[PDB]
């Protein structure tokens, strides 16, 4: 029984091995703890928004949407329909990006390196969509607690449709390279098997729950923006191993394509942010023409809007699981407390149980199938 | 509605068993993967010839910060300090006083580019379009000190990039 | 794509599908980089009367 340290995403991992078996797996985290939750307390809500881009930095607009929903619930306002449709469309695009990153990185760690490039070309195209809509490729900060910052450019929808009509073939190529390969199945089948009750008690969410046969999805059971107006299927696993989670993620990519099609065909007209200048800033022309608009712009960009006192816990179906925010307001324009809930935290906490009686090479597969990004884990 | 991903039961008749045995012994799926890689080998790569070719960009895209001025030549900034107040990273430092002609102008306008997050909140908070985040992104530096911009550097950046900055603003100002 | 017919058939047989139907490199089918000006309508609270803020 020898103890060895896999030092430095960035992870320190302490194990004791009995030959090839993994006996204890003690992950050491905090190598990316930047004190985001304490820094948020010194910012206004608009100022605190860009932290959520950096929390789970593979799914940026999903964290933006979760924070915006929490602030909207505390403010007792609602975004316009077009803003909600844009939010859901870009959330599905973000889910596609996140699942591409997760699947290709998991394959790369095992030893399959070519689909990484194949699908990072598509990732670059989606980054182009992000840049066109917001001016930034990755740390977008586009989704706001009143809606979205800017309306879509006049040719974005056509390019999104053009991208979406060719992505299924890329998924097909990935499946041809991975799904029926016997080496991939030997690396993934019956690895990291977790029971439904254990997953529930360990705090798992998302694919980590659905691969064990638990029929749960926050977009279906607790819909938030317009998710009750779109139709899609929830992939369900049967064995609770890495292979079932891989299949579930591929199926979620296909269903995200389906939802993107529905969103493109049903984009409504109207404004993009709540028509309430005490929360959402006015237009530039109004600010440069009307006295009230200039006053409200000044106050919103210097002090920010005040949020009525209260505490809420708002969760969404993030591409990695249930992403939640426990937001506390004291009545001022700065949040009193902001606790950030990341599914990767619970998944990494369960990594120890998931790796009992497995090879040293299986822990890498379990880490890859858990979809761990340490920005959200450490915060 | 929900879907099953791994709920297929293999057939147990002699033909399907023989097919699976042939797959196991003759390595059919590995040949399929080899064929997929071979098919990718014969298509045009997605590589562009940097730096001679450039990646597509948009007017909205945020680049290096610049201080603009009116067509008459006077700087637009009036030292309202709204960008400094809104800056989520506290990257902007501003000091001001009345000018020799009594105008409200800055004497210090510093942006720490190693603290900036390039969010663009400052340019959307500015009421006179004085501070903008221009399209330049190739401004890497050999030392930390040259990334600490003062007012002279930002005014020089504005005078250097004004043509493209104004074109981008003309393209994008109807969405703001 | 500027690919010869023989290479086209070879890659089609190797992958087992029709690739020219769905190409992964953009071409003239994308939108123009210069676009007409938009209009961006206003919200429901842009009325000149019966629009007191206390009711919204």
């Amino acid at each position: 029984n020898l103890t060895l340290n896999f030092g430095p995403g960035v992870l320190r991992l302490v194990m004791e091995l009995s030959g090839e078996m993994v006996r204890k797996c003690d992950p050491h985290i905090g190598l990316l703890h930047r004190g985001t939750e304490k820094l948020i307390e010194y910012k206004t809500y608009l100022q605190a928004l860009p932290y959520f881009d950096r929390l789970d930095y593979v799914s940026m607009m999903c964290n933006e949407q979760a924070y915006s929903l929490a602030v909207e619930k505390l403010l007792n306002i609602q975004p316009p329909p077009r803003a909600q449709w844009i939010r859901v469309l870009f959330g599905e695009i973000t889910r596609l990006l996140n699942h591409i990153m997760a699947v290709t990185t998991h394959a790369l760690d095992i030893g399959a390196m070519t689909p990484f490039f194949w699908m990072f070309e598509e990732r670059e195209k989606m980054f182009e969509f992000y840049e066109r809509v917001s001016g930034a490729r990755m740390h977008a900060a586009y989704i706001r607690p009143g809606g979205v910052h800017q309306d879509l450019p006049l040719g974005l929808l056509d390019d999104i449709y053009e991208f979406s009509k060719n992505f299924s073939f890329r998924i097909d190529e990935l499946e041809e390279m991975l799904t029926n390969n016997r080496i991939w199945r030997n690396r993934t089948v019956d690895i990291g098997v977790v029971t439904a009750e254990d997953a529930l008690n360990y705090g798992f969410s998302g694919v980590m729950l659905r691969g064990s046969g638990i029929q749960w999805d926050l977009r279906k059971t607790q819909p938030y923006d317009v998710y009750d107006q779109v139709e899609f299927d929830v992939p369900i696993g049967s064995r609770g191993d890495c292979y079932d989670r891989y299949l579930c993620r591929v199926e979620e990519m296909r269903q995200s394509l389906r939802i993107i099609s529905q969103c493109l065909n049903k984009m409504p007209p109207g404004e993009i942010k709540v028509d309430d200048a005490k929360v959402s800033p006015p237009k530039r022309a109004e600010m440069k023409t009307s006295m009230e608009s200039l006053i409200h712009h000044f106050k919103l960009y210097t002090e920010g809007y005040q949020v009525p006192p209260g505490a809420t816990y708002t969760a969404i179906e993030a591409p990695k699981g249930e992403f939640g925010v426990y937001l506390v307001s004291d009545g001022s324009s700065r949040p009193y407390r902001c606790k950030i809930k990341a599914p990767g935290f619970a998944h990494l906490a369960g990594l120890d149980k998931m790796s009992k009686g497995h090879m040293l090479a299986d822990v890498v597969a379990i880490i890859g199938t858990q979809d761990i990004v340490f920005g959200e884990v450490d915060r | 509605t929900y879907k099953f991903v791994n709920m297929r039961e293999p057939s147990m008749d002699m033909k399907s068993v023989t097919d699976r045995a042939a797959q196991t012994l003759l390595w059919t799926e590995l040949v399929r993967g080899l064929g997929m890689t071979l098919s990718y080998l014969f298509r045009e790569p997605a590589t562009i010839n940097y730096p001679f070719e450039k990646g597509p960009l948009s007017p909205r895209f945020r680049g290096e910060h610049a201080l603009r001025r009116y067509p008459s030549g006077e700087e637009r900034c009036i030292a309202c300090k709204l960008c400094e107040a809104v800056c989520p990273a506290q990257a902007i430092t501003i000091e001001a006083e009345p000018r020799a002609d009594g105008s409200r102008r800055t004497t210090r306008y510093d942006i720490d580019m190693t603290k900036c997050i390039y969010c663009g909140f400052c340019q959307e908070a500015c009421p006179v379009d004085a501070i903008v985040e221009g399209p330049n992104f190739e401004f890497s530096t050999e030392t930390h000190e040259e990334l600490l911009y003062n007012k002279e550097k930002l005014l020089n950046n504005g005078d250097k990039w004004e043509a493209e900055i104004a074109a981008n603003i003309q393209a994008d100002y109807l969405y703001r | 794509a500027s690919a010869t017919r023989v290479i086209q058939l070879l890659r089609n047989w190797a992958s087992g599908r029709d690739l020219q139907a769905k190409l992964q490199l953009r071409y003239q089918e994308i939108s123009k980089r210069t676009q007409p000006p938009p209009k961006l309508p206003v919200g429901p609270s842009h009325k000149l009367s019966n629009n007191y803020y206390c009711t919204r």
Partner: peptide, 29 residues
């Protein structure tokens, strides 16, 4: 005078988007 102009789907909507898995069977018994 000028009417509203923003990014909208074309009249009649977009064409269908393929999303189902397509892994064909080549053929050898």
């Amino acid at each position: 005078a000028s009417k509203v102009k923003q990014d909208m789907p074309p009249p009649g909507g977009y064409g269908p988007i393929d999303y189902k898995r397509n892994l064909p069977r080549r053929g050898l018994s």
